[PDB]
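Appendix C: a fully annotated inverse folding record. The material below is reproduced so that readers can follow the format used throughout the book. The structure is listed first as tokens, followed by the designed sequence.
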């Protein structure tokens, strides 16, 4: 559902902001899906520690930035189509964006970024997720 996904997005971003020393006040959601995603994102960031610096540069978010700009930049993660690792990269990218906004004194955008991510997932990623076993296979697969 669209609500499960919005909740999942908020949990990841809150977890990531909290984990880095930031505030999370600016704000399938099974506890298992959320824990698996929390850990998958940490593992991903273990290997890739550049925080999508160029992707974020490409986006260059301000309060004037439109969803479609976000969408175009995130589309780059999926040039070769969707996969579980790329969906984990997507969540991680949103986390990075949220950190940059707080750093730029634009805490106002973290809730915007969250809405955007929820809209992107429901629109572009859920089609592949449902086709590939749903968040259940994600959990079966990860942690």
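Designed amino acids, in order:
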């Amino acid at each position: 559902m669209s609500q499960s996904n919005r909740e999942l997005v908020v949990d990841f971003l809150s977890y990531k902001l909290s984990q880095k020393g930031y505030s999370w006040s600016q704000f399938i959601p099974m506890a298992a899906v959320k824990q698996a995603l929390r850990e998958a994102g940490d593992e991903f960031e273990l290997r890739y520690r550049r925080a999508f610096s160029d992707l974020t540069s490409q986006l260059h978010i301000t309060p004037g930035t439109a969803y479609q700009s976000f969408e175009q930049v995130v589309n780059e993660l999926f040039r070769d189509g969707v996969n579980w690792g790329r969906i984990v990269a997507f969540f991680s990218f949103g986390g990075a964006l949220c950190v940059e906004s707080v750093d730029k004194e634009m805490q106002v955008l973290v809730s915007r970024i969250a809405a955007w991510m929820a809209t992107y997932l429901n629109d572009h990623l859920e089609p592949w997720i449902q086709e590939n076993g749903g968040w259940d296979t994600f959990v079966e697969l990860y942690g």
